[PDB]
Subunit: 332 residues, 4 copies
């Protein structure tokens, strides 16, 4: 008996991938107005933010200025790692000396990454982020495991990115405090194009949460967020926080200079895997200038608070139990 899509193997095409556009949040009974909502959520197992938003570790998104402004908004910024260890560790100190704010930093795998991690820890970093494209590799799982063995008492360790239930479960057993989710959904991403590899984030979050939540490990949604509604959809899918890159790249606190071409205003926004950021799995694009960060954060949270009012969710942990309605291509 042939499978209705080809072959005799039902599990060849495992499941159906849903993205942010595929779904909409169902309104339920509510005692919650946007004003009274509690947007506080867990970034890690130890760290709680007033705003469940994080800025991406990219050289056109998050450094000193951004990382500080993000913390003061209630969230947190993660410093990118496309620069000498000495300066990145220096930026950590600049943030921490601005009022003891929360800050994160990105590291890869290997000796260079390990050395970098130690300097960051000494610099007083709060969260180390093992930044890889495919965290289901056994090298990444070891990088997380040993880091947690050495500095796990005073520093939080986060692994990513994953897109499957098994990958997230592997990170949990590795000792990760949080599991960042997103393989391919990025705006400047071309992993889906050059490798044909990816997983629609709504399904990706749902699968990852199914492995992390039973272990009490927070999940970070990374990439593919175009609007504030996507943030609410991500958290309702089970995620605890959301990492933004495209939505913050046009802000003034973000790296890259202004672009007054065409009479309009833009800012540079490139993937960390773009040819000019070093087979290129990223592109160097532009994003419309969106003014100060605080203005953008205020409206992203505003839409989030609205969704919590529609779904009758007083807290984020309740919003994570909302229900979706599936949307047909005519939904746009």
């Amino acid at each position: 008996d042939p499978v209705p899509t080809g072959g005799d193997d039902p599990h060849k095409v495992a499941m159906l991938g849903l993205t942010f556009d595929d779904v909409l949040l169902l309104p339920a009974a509510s005692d919650v107005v946007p004003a009274t909502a509690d947007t506080s959520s867990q970034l890690t197992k130890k760290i709680r933010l007033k705003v469940p938003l994080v800025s991406s570790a990219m050289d056109t998104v998050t450094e000193s200025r951004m990382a500080i402004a993000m913390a003061r908004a209630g969230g947190m910024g993660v410093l990118h790692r496309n620069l000498p260890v000495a300066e990145q560790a220096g930026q950590v100190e600049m943030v921490k000396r601005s009022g003891g704010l929360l800050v994160g930093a990105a590291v890869g795998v290997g000796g260079d990454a390990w050395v970098r991690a130690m300097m960051l820890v000494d610099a007083g970093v709060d969260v180390l982020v093992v930044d890889t494209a495919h965290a289901h590799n056994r090298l990444v799982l070891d990088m997380v495991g040993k880091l947690k063995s050495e500095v796990g008492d005073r520093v939080e360790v986060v692994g990513g990115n994953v897109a499957t239930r098994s990958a997230a479960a592997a990170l949990v057993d590795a000792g990760a405090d949080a599991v960042k989710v997103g393989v391919g959904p990025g705006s400047i991403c071309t992993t889906r194009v050059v490798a044909g590899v990816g997983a629609p984030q709504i399904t990706a979050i749902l699968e990852a949460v199914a492995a992390c939540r039973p272990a009490g490990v927070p999940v970070i949604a990374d990439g593919g967020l175009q609007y504030s509604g996507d943030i609410a959809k991500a958290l309702a899918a089970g995620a605890s926080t959301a990492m933004l890159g495209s939505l913050l790249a046009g802000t003034a606190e973000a790296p890259g200079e202004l672009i007054f071409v065409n009479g309009k205003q833009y800012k540079s926004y490139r993937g960390m895997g773009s040819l000019g950021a070093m087979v290129p799995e990223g592109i160097e694009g532009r994003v419309p200038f969106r003014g100060p960060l605080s203005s953008v954060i205020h409206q992203l949270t505003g839409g989030l608070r609205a969704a919590m009012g529609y779904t009758g969710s007083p807290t984020i942990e309740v919003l994570q139990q909302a229900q979706f309605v599936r949307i047909t291509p005519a939904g746009l």
Copy 2:
């Protein structure tokens, strides 16, 4: 066992949302020609219209001129509430003194809305419309309940908007005469975008009717109507009347001045939740000038009468029992 879209929860993604474009009306045996059709239907439990159409309570759609012309066409207009109570109540009297025509008015929740409601009732209004974005909030359900307790004998009370079966059922038990349906499908709406919250109207109507019809409570379809066919689809989905905003905003009887820019003619059409109508959940757009109201109403009903001829529906109550055929994205 994993759900084919993620997670182990089958009810996480509850149902599949259908919109007007997703469906088409199936032709059946007919003794009905468009000329002999009876378009009369129930707006409320007490009030019946010759034309099952209502103009939206928006400051660019329905005031004195529109509300009068709508009644004379067989339908009814609902006065918006973005203006002093004294003037809105005055517009009610202007309509009622033009031949004892039917008129509706919109109110919110709280003290201001209650005071406004009393002035409108004293002004001789026929239908009070509790105009909210999310009527499943217990504050709205109380606003409807107490209003019906005070002036329910001489004034009809309508609650909205809902998008789910449970929400509509709550409005029925609150004592509502009619339940208006539509969360997100509006043309100038951005609730789906900023909050990620909504429900495709065909499914939204079907679910709401499943709760209202057994209680004998009429259902109003609100928003998402681009063509006259959508009106027929809405009523066939179970709705008794349809509320139009975009289709009437370009009419001469509608507020907002003419726009002769580009050598073409347009009129202002903004959502009541747009930034300039006061986190903005609406936009200020333009719609093509469509001449007098009576001309538009005549052709909307004409398409409605045609659909009643194809489906063999002599009355609207029979049209509500028509069958749909589901359309693939290649349907456009």
Copy 3:
């Protein structure tokens, strides 16, 4: 238990509608080359054509010139009825006197149509076509029934259009020799838009054939044919012949003058329900000039012969037993 698309009624949304773009013909074992294929098929129960194509009864498609050229190509033309009976009957004689060619003519319902039918029969017409938008009306079923009772011995009677199994079955019992299928799929059609009524033709043909074929009554596919592949898809869906309008409107043998505007060449093509052809259910559009008819027919049949080579179909009656593969929106 709620239906996954709304309501508690599984039959509210009866079935899923497939159009020509939704499907593709599956290649099978073949002893057939395009050269050796037999494109002959049944227009009616008595009449067989060398080419299973018919030109639409429209005032911008089929009159004297077209009806003659169609017959000489192996097919047949159906004269439209937007003109005095005296002239339409005269055009029948002009065709018949050009070598005893096959010709069809369109009539409506009522006294005028009955009188028209008699003049056409006296003029030596071979096929009378009851041309209506909704042939499931009992007035149409009577028009077919009595016509077949009066002149059924020497003239073939065809009813249309239908889109459902029950409608086609009603036409068969009325005594129809052929059942024309198509409600809404027309290019210049707006029935789907103004009335929200229609049925995707692949499904429409499949349902109609399921009622006609057991009774041995040929089925005509009408409207929605953009390419020659659609012709092969229509016949493989069970149809015996296909009626073309858009594909022949740009031909020189078709009514309407040349349009040299923009430096390109077009011809007038309007629906019989367009405002200028007399609530308008049609539009007045333009189609690219495609030269002589014989050139177009030669290439439409060429693509048809190719499909018969891929599917291993020596005759049209074998092609009607081909299998489809369903195509996702990424199919385009």
Copy 4:
């Protein structure tokens, strides 16, 4: 009981067709980095390539220059047959004398093709490719069978193209060393348009592999490849090698001259069934100039190596066991 898409026959619409855009590769546990991957795979039952890529047998894609450069890159080129046998056989010798490189050549069916095949074999060709549009014809199956009987000991025989399980199974029993798959998915192809015949390649590969792999016969994916990800998707679907035409037509080693029109650079790329290549089942289009071949091959393989890193596939034979996730139209 009616089938939800029409008719009473469930097998009328056999299965659902998936293309490259419909699917994405699921990331799994990996010990594989792109550097350590082994891209080697089987072109035929006897011949193994270092790079699983083949250039299409088209007069705008693969001749002497291309066929040589392809072999030196690890793959192989297949010489087209739109030229005298004397010259095509001469091009084989030019390739073989450049270091004993691997080369293929295309033949049709009949006497001319048989004579051509013998000259090619004498010219020292390694792979004969029976190039037809529909290899499920019994004439093609005989052409493959007898060729393998005459020169099967010293020359490999490949049949194509197929799109169904039964067609591929027929080629295997005919004695084919490899089965090329692809009916309709070509970029310059119009078989889907003029004949309405085709089969989405992911499903087409899956069905063909289900018949070939049990017999140990390699499968070639032909046409429909827009990106390097599609190559990884094709092989993961079960294919052993992929035939490229559009991706290599813009290369300098490809036939057709440069096109400096519009200030940009293009090259001629026409189907072998295009009107100017001799009912036309092809078109004469243009493709952007992409520089040398080696540069393109290096990046196609680079994306392939990436996908092998994400899916934990050390070898191509392991990549063939990867799992897909189905993507909704919102996936783009």
